[PDB]
Design a protein around this ligand. Structure first.
Ligand SMILES: C=CC1=C(C)[C@@H](Cc2[nH]c(/C=C3N=C(/C=C4\NC(=O)[C@H](C)[C@H]4CC)C(C)=C\3CCC(=O)O)c(CCC(=O)O)c2C)NC1=O
Ligand SMILES: C=CC1=C(C)[C@@H](Cc2[nH]c(/C=C3N=C(/C=C4\NC(=O)[C@H](C)[C@H]4CC)C(C)=C\3CCC(=O)O)c(CCC(=O)O)c2C)NC1=O
Ligand SMILES: C=CC1=C(C)[C@@H](Cc2[nH]c(/C=C3N=C(/C=C4\NC(=O)[C@H](C)[C@H]4CC)C(C)=C\3CCC(=O)O)c(CCC(=O)O)c2C)NC1=O
Ligand SMILES: C=CC1=C(C)[C@@H](Cc2[nH]c(/C=C3N=C(/C=C4\NC(=O)[C@H](C)[C@H]4CC)C(C)=C\3CCC(=O)O)c(CCC(=O)O)c2C)NC1=O
Ligand SMILES: C=CC1=C(C)[C@@H](Cc2[nH]c(/C=C3N=C(/C=C4\NC(=O)[C@H](C)[C@H]4CC)C(C)=C\3CCC(=O)O)c(CCC(=O)O)c2C)NC1=O
Ligand SMILES: C=CC1=C(C)[C@@H](Cc2[nH]c(/C=C3N=C(/C=C4\NC(=O)[C@H](C)[C@H]4CC)C(C)=C\3CCC(=O)O)c(CCC(=O)O)c2C)NC1=O
Ligand SMILES: C=CC1=C(C)[C@@H](Cc2[nH]c(/C=C3N=C(/C=C4\NC(=O)[C@H](C)[C@H]4CC)C(C)=C\3CCC(=O)O)c(CCC(=O)O)c2C)NC1=O
Ligand SMILES: C=CC1=C(C)[C@@H](Cc2[nH]c(/C=C3N=C(/C=C4\NC(=O)[C@H](C)[C@H]4CC)C(C)=C\3CCC(=O)O)c(CCC(=O)O)c2C)NC1=O
Ligand SMILES: C=CC1=C(C)[C@@H](Cc2[nH]c(/C=C3N=C(/C=C4\NC(=O)[C@H](C)[C@H]4CC)C(C)=C\3CCC(=O)O)c(CCC(=O)O)c2C)NC1=O
Ligand SMILES: C=CC1=C(C)[C@@H](Cc2[nH]c(/C=C3N=C(/C=C4\NC(=O)[C@H](C)[C@H]4CC)C(C)=C\3CCC(=O)O)c(CCC(=O)O)c2C)NC1=O
Ligand SMILES: C=CC1=C(C)[C@@H](Cc2[nH]c(/C=C3N=C(/C=C4\NC(=O)[C@H](C)[C@H]4CC)C(C)=C\3CCC(=O)O)c(CCC(=O)O)c2C)NC1=O
Ligand SMILES: C=CC1=C(C)[C@@H](Cc2[nH]c(/C=C3N=C(/C=C4\NC(=O)[C@H](C)[C@H]4CC)C(C)=C\3CCC(=O)O)c(CCC(=O)O)c2C)NC1=O
Ligand SMILES: C=CC1=C(C)[C@@H](Cc2[nH]c(/C=C3N=C(/C=C4\NC(=O)[C@H](C)[C@H]4CC)C(C)=C\3CCC(=O)O)c(CCC(=O)O)c2C)NC1=O
Ligand SMILES: CCC1=C(C)[C@@H](CC2=N/C(=C\c3[nH]c(C[C@@H]4NC(=O)C(C)=C4CC)c(C)c3CCC(=O)O)C(CCC(=O)O)=C2C)NC1=O
Lengths: 164, 177, 250, 73, 49, 164, 164, 177, 177
């Protein structure tokens, strides 16, 4: 839950200090940038079944080796468990677009994922090819605002970098 | 820790007895069948990565409310800590199958495991099923009856070592029950 | 204008290293200063990754607070810098004795032959990895709380014989265990240590349960060599965390 | 250390003259693996000069060093 | 040898018997054939084991 | 460099003790198993260019996305670096059969491998698809002896349990 | 309790590893060397009423100044407790041969004994004459086998160097 | 630390070679020597309490300036530390003879021992004598030519093992020179 | 400096003993093999220009990054200083083979060679492979087993001189690393 709020409050709690004018000046940027990220949050919250259907079959159009026997996506009950996770990651993008900071992506979807995907033999390049499909399916005047699409694709790039 | 040789000594120390021939022949057949014990605990460690992945994904396959929002294996932070705990348990049974005694499992691991898990809210019924899947995995690797991998061994019968590792997965299964 | 040529003491830095004689004495001194402040970069870089475990997602945890009042953080600076001044006032039996005490403990701690090579060569890297292994897993004596009243008596008996190694052989005090060096400076550390005792009880449910299993590992592969000492470490993890190393005499 | 010292004084001199020359048997700092001169000269028919290379300086090389001091210096 | 006395210690090669040498030719240079040379010198003197 | 000797010396060095009879009893066990693994070590050194040719493409025949553009092995430079890596792992198994411990694999082939194949986007189930072909092509009574298989197949499975 | 099984597991626990091929190779030395230290175990089990009495007066042959008043051993229960000590010390060597290690002599016989023998004003040189009598009264082919006598007289002089 | 088998694979790694059958019989000679090497490191550790009493009491009668007022081994605190360091040095030679390599002697003990003794003020002339007294005590106890005590071995020749342990004892003297 | 004769004198001077007939016969064996020692120094010095070019162009043949731009043996100014440095290492080893003691090599060549290559950036992994090729060249020239140059000697064993010269090349390699 690394916000702009929880960063400057917990850093002021380590010195044992009152909130000073450097702390309040950081929250003034939260009343400047929140119009773009809450626009992109409500655009994702009303269109999410359309975009995780479009993302997940770009993974299996590229990586068609997964539908082989003995591989990962070999029966129907675990292809449905794959789109479960693309819906899980877009929900965490929508949470961190609300709080304005990478915390919901960090401690609920990333912090332990490399231990899990290796042990269950899940290819993390298939997760990248879904998340980096929606970053360049987006076109900035049609789908959201100009600065709403800046901060939306910037939270996808955190998800591409933490898996790659 | 202690082992199968040290258990006989600390038993005989309380009677102030010398270790004579009344209880050395139990230790003599421990050593004379000792090449099957190293043939046993090699077959567990040679499959120990897949024996946690077949375990805790079959535990969720029989109790699918563990990955529900609120469950014990919901986030990636929590599914990784159950996969971590699924191979600390298999490691100390491998330390007990090799030593031939369950004192390395009892004191270093199971002392305070039940009083840990009730301060964290780990479900103490589905955790038994991840243990009891692994007991069924191990005894098909001891007796070479796993249906997907066949290891090459010598001929003979080693049913007493499949029943000892089955006795070790119940000391952990009764520790948190 | 003056006629100001470059000096003889300034042109000597442009000289190429030679291999024997007095010209090997210059290069042996210039490399042993360049290995000394490379060793300081080795100890600084390890502490900057053990401090990244108390910032586990980007926000400052309760482990890395300084003091709670107004001027309770500036005076935590002003007695760490005089703690390092009294560190290099010890004699040769304490500086070299702690170098070999740290080198025994750092090679149990190492995980590969590259790591255990570098703890032998660089002494301050091995001294700042004994402490950096304990501040991560919270196996210290400022982090362990006793969960009984026999456990508090067991850890006070271990801490009774650690307080005599901060005394000399005739029985007088060293300069190793010193609280105050100025007027009223002892009571500021009395305030700052009661504050960090309160934050140790404010840990999470799993943060108390991970350091139960970490203080039992720390007392049984660094300070136990028998089976009866393993019984005092596998059942009472607060006496297994008061077992300090013998480098610092606390 | 006592008498046998230096004067440091980098400037020391004071005059803006035209420069005199050097030798050619100097340390060059470019190609330091070179013979240069003193391979075809009357360097070959003198005895070779003594440079200290031992840390110990044994007592028959101590006397052989100071004979070169009284002869050359 | 009756017209070339200097040919002693010259290996004849493939037509004579195999010669023996406690060489120890390695980069740490130690002889690896202390076993076989002892097994071969027993056969030079006694002819058998 | 974990072996039979380096375990029992450093266990005595940390304890501050002389070598006693429990330390010399372990080196006696290094004498009896030495005939089996050094038979497997000399079999691997005289056959390795046919093993990694059959093993280099054991995975390449298994997985094939690598030869599409943008994948891992898309040109002959990157294919030759894949056979470079199967030959590096078959060389490190050969050093482990000599020392009698996982020490050569633990420090030159495993430590850092998860943090390298991730950031260079290397599929870690294509390495294990070549090590497990080597473990299954090994028939026992033609290639080596009986207990030369149980040392050679156990060091292959230590590489499989540490990669994936 | 230092032994040959409880130091390869206790060093594999400190690194968090499984028992590897290095660890099973150390246990097979307790298959080959076990038939000699258990061969010397029955011989000490069947002779300890004799050899303790034989080692008890070997102390009193060297030190006849024990039994005087003013000095220590002036009565009977100070004398019969000396046979109680050296029957314990023969029992711990009999324990040491069974475990395959120097475990039971360490924590029961050796540990703390330098403070008990000092403060009770017992001469510690009187103990070592009784132990070293049985190191010399043993002749090797008559009593036990060849490699049983090198095991039995490895713990006896371990006790001698630990005493003084 | 290294041993004999790990020394010959860090040299084959440097030229990227497999350890084939050319330098394997250099290692097969180490295994056939193994019962003599194990028979012989038992000889030093059985007598090691007397080998440090025979060494540092020989040094104080050859040099009686060590028990002079202000010496190195003058007071009762300093005599116990010289008695400690004689057994530390003998302990690391015993690890080097058992491993078959001087790697554990060189770095864990000898690296930094010279400027330790320079900063402490140990006279380094005396320490060469007291480590060469123990070198003579080692090769008397290896090859069974000790006058007051004889040990029961099998018959054979072990002068290569006695000259290898003498190679480690003057490696101590070269480091502190 | 010292040789093999005055090494025995300084070991005997520390005990104030006359060197007598009990250890003169290990110096008479130095004299009786003294023709083969000179026979072997002649085989190294006759081939020493070809030994330092088969070495440092085999160091380039196994590490092509030295002749890459920015490398250590990149330009002509730098390759000539590596080829100079090969034949000072070979020159000081043959002074120590001819003396039978390595103390000219340790006091005039390996005294600060490590601290000079650190301040120059000479890569120490490549300056072991230059020395360890030259060790294998020397042992092939002592024991007369070089393939492209056969010489003629009288019959008899000389592997005790090839093993002494191999251990002088393991002190060049163990002082710069
Ligand atoms: C809180 C956030 C959160 C996440 C980020 C994910 C993370 C996550 N993914 C999986 C689990 C999974 N993820 C997949 C997905 C795939 N494998 C395939 O066969 C396809 C190629 C690919 C689709 C992209 C599969 C199959 C599993 C189950 C593991 C298995 O069946 O072995 C599991 C195990 C439990 C399960 O079955 O759901 C967890 C915790 N789940 C979460 O709860
Ligand atoms: C909240 C997240 C969110 C998104 C990222 C987009 C993703 C998205 N794009 C399209 C659908 C489309 N998207 C484009 C857009 C483009 N094609 C181009 O050549 C240009 C580069 C780019 C912007 C002009 C076009 C032309 C279609 C219709 C044809 C098609 O489906 O490809 C659709 C299907 C119907 C629709 O909604 O338009 C969806 C779900 N929509 C969302 O709701
Ligand atoms: C030496 C012995 C030893 C052990 C036995 C373990 C025991 C153990 N497990 C957990 C910790 C945990 N254990 C689980 C486990 C589970 N939840 C489930 O659904 C399953 C039933 C089960 C996995 C099989 C989870 C989910 C956590 C993390 C709790 C959380 O963060 O939500 C913790 C707290 C530390 C942490 O945060 O990880 C400890 C001490 N650790 C040890 O050191
Ligand atoms: C979601 C549905 C789902 C499941 C219900 C489980 C399926 C499953 N498999 C096993 C059972 C097993 N699992 C293994 C493990 C392995 N077998 C091998 O050959 C490999 C080497 C290794 C890991 C890949 C073994 C050895 C058994 C024992 C049975 C057998 O092999 O015949 C068990 C234990 C039986 C019991 O409860 O007693 C279960 C429940 N997995 C799933 O995905
Ligand atoms: C240090 C490494 C090391 C090992 C891994 C083992 C390897 C090993 N296992 C066996 C030998 C054997 N192993 C088995 C075991 C089995 N056979 C079966 O049919 C069961 C499926 C399976 C149980 C796991 C049997 C039955 C024998 C032969 C009989 C016996 O040894 O008592 C033998 C032969 C022993 C002999 O010939 O006397 C060896 C060397 N030993 C070692 O020294
Ligand atoms: C790399 C990780 C790393 C950290 C997370 C921080 C942790 C940390 N340590 C100290 C400060 C300190 N930490 C110690 C250390 C210890 N005390 C003992 O009893 C043991 C010997 C040892 C436990 C490891 C000491 C002696 C101080 C000085 C203040 C004090 O005496 O408590 C302080 C400042 C004082 C305060 O908390 O108010 C902080 C933030 N430092 C780090 O370097
Ligand atoms: C001594 C230990 C040691 C290793 C274990 C390997 C590990 C390793 N592999 C690569 C590097 C590589 N490894 C591969 C390998 C593969 N690509 C595929 O198609 C398959 C997945 C696989 C063969 C089976 C490729 C293609 C590269 C080049 C990646 C790149 O483009 O940077 C690199 C980067 C340096 C290089 O290019 O060589 C390293 C360190 N190398 C080592 O030196
Ligand atoms: C001031 C007078 C005085 C001395 C001169 C010394 C006596 C002394 N003894 C030894 C030499 C020795 N010391 C021992 C040790 C022992 N022998 C045994 O059989 C026992 C088990 C153990 C002692 C209890 C051994 C084995 C030798 C080797 C020579 C030998 O005795 O055969 C040496 C080494 C010879 C050398 O310099 O190379 C010296 C100097 N001690 C003194 O106090
Ligand atoms: C692991 C490697 C390792 C070592 C080698 C030793 C090294 C060592 N020796 C001494 C310390 C000492 N060493 C000596 C020894 C001697 N004086 C002499 O001239 C004799 C030659 C020699 C006796 C044989 C003395 C007398 C002291 C104590 C100095 C003093 O307080 O007077 C100290 C100082 C700390 C202390 O007091 O113990 C250290 C670190 N310790 C180690 O941990
Ligand atoms: C735990 C403790 C432990 C030990 C002490 C050794 C004990 C030991 N020493 C030897 C065995 C032997 N030891 C020697 C050694 C010697 N003969 C001499 O003349 C020299 C004086 C001396 C060494 C310096 C010889 C020559 C043999 C027989 C050769 C051989 O075993 O191959 C043997 C082989 C038995 C035999 O083959 O007869 C054993 C088990 N092993 C152990 O496990
Ligand atoms: C008595 C002993 C003695 C020596 C051993 C040499 C040691 C030596 N070498 C160099 C100097 C050098 N040494 C090297 C050598 C190498 N780079 C490599 O890759 C190879 C590993 C290695 C050659 C085999 C190079 C390349 C330089 C020149 C540095 C440069 O200008 O780039 C210098 C600096 C001064 C000078 O260049 O003259 C010295 C003192 N000189 C001595 O007097
Ligand atoms: C293109 C790449 C390239 C190489 C890889 C090297 C090839 C090479 N040659 C030698 C090895 C050698 N080089 C010589 C030198 C000579 N032999 C003679 O008979 C002449 C007198 C003299 C050269 C004129 C000798 C004597 C050996 C030893 C092996 C032998 O000849 O049998 C070694 C040492 C083996 C080792 O690593 O230990 C190597 C790597 N040279 C190269 O150019
Ligand atoms: C001024 C320069 C000068 C020399 C170079 C040597 C030259 C030389 N070498 C040998 C003589 C010999 N040389 C060898 C040498 C060898 N045989 C081998 O198999 C090895 C390959 C090789 C040396 C490494 C042997 C074995 C003898 C005869 C044994 C002896 O030394 O008497 C002899 C004969 C001595 C005699 O008459 O008995 C001479 C004169 N002497 C000198 O005065
Ligand atoms: C070497 C003797 C020494 C110390 C001890 C500290 C002590 C110290 N910490 C401070 C202040 C301070 N301390 C921390 C926590 C701390 N900071 C970090 O970067 C990390 C990783 C931390 C441990 C978790 C924070 C977050 C601040 C506030 C600084 C800021 O972020 O603005 C302040 C300033 C207080 C103030 O200005 O009011 C001091 C004097 N400084 C020293 O010079």
């Amino acid at each position: 839950m690394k916000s702009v709020i929880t960063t400057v409050v917990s850093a002021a709690d380590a010195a044992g200090r009152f909130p000073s004018n450097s702390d309040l000046e950081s929250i003034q940027g939260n009343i400047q940038r929140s119009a773009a990220r809450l626009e992109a949050a409500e655009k994702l919250a009303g269109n999410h079944e359309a975009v995780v259907k479009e993302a997940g079959d770009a993974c299996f159009a590229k990586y068609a080796y997964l539908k082989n026997p003995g591989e990962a996506g070999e029966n129907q009950e675990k292809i449905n468990k794959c789109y479960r996770d693309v819906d899980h990651y877009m929900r965490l993008v929508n949470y961190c677009l609300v709080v304005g900071g990478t915390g919901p992506l960090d401690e609920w979807g990333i912090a332990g994922a490399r231990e899990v995907y290796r042990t269950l033999n899940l290819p993390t390049s298939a997760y990248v090819a879904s998340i980096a499909y929606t970053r360049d399916r987006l076109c900035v005047p049609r789908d959201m605002s100009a600065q709403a699409g800046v901060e939306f694709s910037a939270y996808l790039d955190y998800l591409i970098n933490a898996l790659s | 820790m202690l082992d199968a040789f040290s258990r006989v000594v600390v038993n005989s120390d309380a009677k102030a007895a010398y270790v004579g021939g009344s209880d050395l022949q139990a230790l003599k057949s421990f050593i004379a069948d000792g090449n099957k014990r190293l043939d046993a605990v090699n077959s567990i460690v040679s499959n120990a990565s897949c024996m946690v992945s077949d375990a805790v994904s079959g535990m969720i396959c029989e109790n699918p409310g563990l990955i529900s929002p609120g469950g014990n294996c919901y986030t990636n932070r929590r599914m990784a800590a159950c996969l971590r705990d699924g191979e600390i348990i298999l490691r100390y049974v491998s330390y007990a199958l090799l030593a031939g005694d369950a004192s390395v499992l009892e004191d270093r691991c199971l002392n305070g495991l039940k009083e840990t898990y009730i301060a964290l809210g780990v479900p103490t019924n589905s955790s038994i099923r991840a243990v009891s899947i692994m007991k069924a995995q191990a005894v098909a690797f001891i007796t070479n009856t796993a249906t997907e991998r066949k290891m090459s061994f010598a001929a003979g019968d080693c049913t007493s070592l499949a029943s000892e590792v089955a006795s070790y997965f119940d000391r952990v299964g009764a520790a948190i029950s | 204008v003056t006629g100001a040529v470059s000096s003889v003491n300034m042109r000597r830095f442009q000289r190429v290293p030679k291999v024997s004689g007095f010209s090997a004495k210059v290069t042996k001194k210039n490399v042993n200063k360049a290995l000394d402040k490379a060793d300081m970069f080795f100890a600084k870089s390890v502490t900057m990754e053990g401090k990244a475990a108390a910032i586990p997602y980007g926000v400052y945890g309760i482990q890395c607070m300084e003091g709670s009042a107004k001027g309770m953080a500036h005076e935590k600076r002003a007695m760490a810098l005089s703690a390092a001044f009294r560190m290099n006032q010890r004699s040769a039996a304490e500086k070299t004795g702690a170098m070999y005490e740290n080198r025994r403990l750092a090679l149990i701690l190492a995980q590969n032959d590259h790591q255990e090579k570098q703890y032998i060569k660089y002494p301050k890297l091995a001294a700042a990895a004994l402490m950096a292994s304990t501040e991560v897993t919270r196996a210290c004596q400022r982090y362990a709380v006793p969960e009984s009243i026999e456990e508090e008596f067991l850890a006070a008996s271990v801490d009774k014989v650690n307080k005599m190694r901060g005394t000399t052989a005739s029985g007088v005090y060293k300069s190793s265990c010193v609280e105050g060096n100025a007027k009223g400076q002892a009571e500021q550390a009395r305030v700052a240590a009661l504050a960090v005792a309160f934050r140790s009880a404010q840990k999470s449910a799993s943060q108390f349960a991970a350091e139960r299993y970490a203080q039992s590992k720390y007392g049984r592969d660094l300070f136990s060599s028998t089976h009866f000492e393993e019984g005092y470490a596998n059942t009472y993890p607060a006496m297994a965390a008061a077992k300090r190393a013998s480098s610092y005499g606390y | 250390l006592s008498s046998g010292s230096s004067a440091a004084v980098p400037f020391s001199t004071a005059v803006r003259f035209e420069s005199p020359s050097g030798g050619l048997d100097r340390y060059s700092r470019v190609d330091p693996a070179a013979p240069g001169p003193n391979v075809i000269t009357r360097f070959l028919f003198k005895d070779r000069p003594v440079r200290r290379s031992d840390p110990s300086l044994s007592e028959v090389d101590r006397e052989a060093t100071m004979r070169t001091v009284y002869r050359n210096v | 040898q009756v017209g070339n006395p200097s040919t002693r210690s010259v290996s004849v090669g493939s037509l004579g018997p195999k010669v023996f040498k406690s060489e120890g030719i390695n980069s740490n240079a130690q002889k690896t054939n202390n076993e076989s040379i002892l097994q071969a010198s027993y056969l030079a003197v006694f002819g058998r084991m």
